[PDB]
Design a protein around this ligand. Structure first.
Ligand code: NA
Ligand code: NA
Lengths: 377, 377
């Protein structure tokens, strides 16, 4: 017999996604172990190596679902709460990687995100963090909302805290990548606000993603203004990916509500829809609940007027080799926005600069703390 | 330009070691991110793919040292203690993977382990764990010793705690792999005792590793007997690898001091020295501070008398395809030791079953809790 291993062909093919799958070493957010990737890919069918093909991502979903199922079995039989929670977190991570680039069964994708959300709410019960979970009603939309306080937080022993609002990207899950980013701010004794806007988190495939997400961010700001535990004069908005695009929108429309805004590899406009690589066409189609023929028009509407003023301090992290948000458009925005925009550009990094995420989140978290200090914290 | 990536040839070649390098997702123990492996291997010289060659592990040490240096630079410039500690942990992990399979410069290897230990002691200052660091004097040997208490531990608000003593393997570092394992017991409100015996941790390359490590474990037991904070009637010994061999020795010589013992892929005897794969000959040579010609005699002395009685409950985790501690010898011990020995055997796993470490440490930690409960906890 040969030891369980990932095929050389497969591991190389998946190189772009391995930094995404491992993401950030986290205390609360679900995260895979190397062994989970081996469990998912060790029996992956050979001759199936096309990242743009529906058949690849079907087998990916099936194989990652099996690893998630194995962790639920461990969770169900766990002899302690601490063991139960670790198994649930592992299951949630596996189900996320099963679903994040799978679009061909809407009901199956929604089912997997519901599994993750169920695992998350169960993890909160046994956690040592204060989580305020509620719906924010925006017009007819009931927005899932999580206000999370730092370890050992007591309202009676604290002044009002600074708060970072973090947005999902196109294919992130709120309790996975976003909670992972959020831990950098929780670690610095800041509150964090994470949320499921239309077409985001648990709403992906249920409601179309809203281009004007700043409308939903405004409703979060009003909640934080009313909450005595939060210093509404010390607010940051952070977006990753498409969420970074929302970060640029927030900067233009409601920037004066924020001490600073962080844009993790969002841009003022997306590359031509027709020529998008890998599964990105189906990804954008699924998020917007639209077909191929309607997407370039949406991209045209998405494109920002970079002449419109930036109303706060913006920090952008971007890769020179980003094929979704081209660096030239970000650099054009950087020059135009001038003293109010700082660009950290990684010369040999692809979209989201995920080989640098540990180092840049250290730098980003310290930069946000600095902006709060500059506003008299 | 092309994005920074690990060569397909290199990633496949290193398959055996990738589960070791990632190890366990940990809160305190230093751990790499995927991006750190990319930083180490993205500019690794081509045509250098022999895991048994001195030249491969030299370039490995050089390239991992560069990533460690980068994190020390981040640590030195960090604007917060939380950022400082995260950078130090990342540096420590990188320096460990630089040194763990590098033996050709004794002074350089010792220097890298000193860097790790310096980073660790600095991390303790800012940590939320009570660490009792001292020397245990055994004869003329001054043994580095760490007694670590669970999160939020107060002697006044607790009964005497159970304690797990964990041993290094041949090439582990105490604050990396062993602290990673230890977190499973800290999570269950147990004390943990981690230590640098002769030829272990900081002493690797300074003093020859002691075959009779149980002598040093006895001195830890006496300390725990004297400490009012520890319930000396609720003690576990866990060893990984060669440390698992020590676990079997402890079971035979001082088992009656322990409610239970865990053997993570140790065995009663090692495979023929001459035919050991990869860098294992140089690994054993370095640990024992002996040349090739003397090692088979040491292996002959190492071999246990499995007829000698097992004096407590033993749990062994072992891979069918282990090429260092052959499964046949473990299964022979399992049958002989009978009701006092439990074997978890993974059919398609290599040495230490590292593709299963998350799931088996959940099972192992729950098993240890169960043994304490059976002894009236
Ligand atoms: Na407020
Ligand atoms: Na005691």
């Amino acid at each position: 017999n040969k030891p369980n291993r990932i095929s050389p062909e497969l591991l190389a093919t998946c190189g772009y996604f391995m930094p995404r799958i491992f993401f950030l070493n986290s205390q609360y957010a679900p995260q895979v172990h190397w062994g989970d990737v081996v469990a998912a890919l060790s029996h992956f069918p050979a001759g199936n190596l096309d990242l743009s093909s529906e058949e690849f991502w079907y087998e990916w979903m099936i194989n990652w679902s099996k690893v998630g199922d194995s962790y639920i079995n461990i969770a169900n039989s766990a002899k302690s709460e601490v063991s139960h929670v670790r198994a649930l977190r592992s299951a949630a991570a596996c189900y996320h990687w099963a679903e994040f680039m799978y679009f061909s069964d809407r009901s199956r994708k929604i089912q997997l995100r519901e599994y993750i959300r169920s695992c998350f709410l169960s993890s909160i019960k046994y956690s040592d963090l204060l989580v305020d979970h509620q719906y924010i009603v925006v017009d007819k939309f009931h927005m899932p909302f999580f206000l999370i306080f730092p370890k050992g937080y007591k309202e009676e022993e604290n002044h009002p805290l600074p708060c970072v609002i973090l947005s999902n990207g196109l294919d992130s899950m709120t309790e996975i990548e976003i909670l992972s980013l959020a831990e950098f701010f929780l670690g610095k004794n800041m509150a964090v606000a994470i949320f499921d806007g239309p077409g985001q988190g648990i709403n992906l495939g249920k409601s179309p993603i809203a281009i004007d997400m700043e409308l939903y961010v405004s409703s979060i700001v009003k909640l934080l203004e009313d909450d005595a535990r939060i210093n509404s004069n010390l607010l940051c908005f952070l977006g990753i990916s498409f969420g970074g695009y929302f970060a640029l929108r927030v900067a233009q429309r409601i920037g004066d509500k924020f001490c600073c805004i962080v844009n993790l590899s969002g841009g003022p406009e997306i590359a031509e829809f027709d020529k998008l690589p890998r599964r990105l066409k189906e990804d954008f189609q699924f998020a917007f609940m639209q077909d191929n023929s309607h997407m370039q028009s949406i991209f045209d509407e998405i494109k920002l007027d970079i002449s419109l003023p930036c109303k706060t301090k913006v920090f952008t992290v971007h890769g020179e080799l980003d094929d979704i948000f081209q660096i030239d458009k970000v650099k054009k925005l950087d020059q135009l926005w001038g003293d109010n925009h700082q660009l950290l550009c990684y010369e040999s990094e692809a979209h989201v600069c995920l080989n640098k995420i540990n180092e840049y989140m250290i730098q980003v978290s310290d930069w946000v703390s600095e902006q709060f200090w500059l506003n008299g914290y």
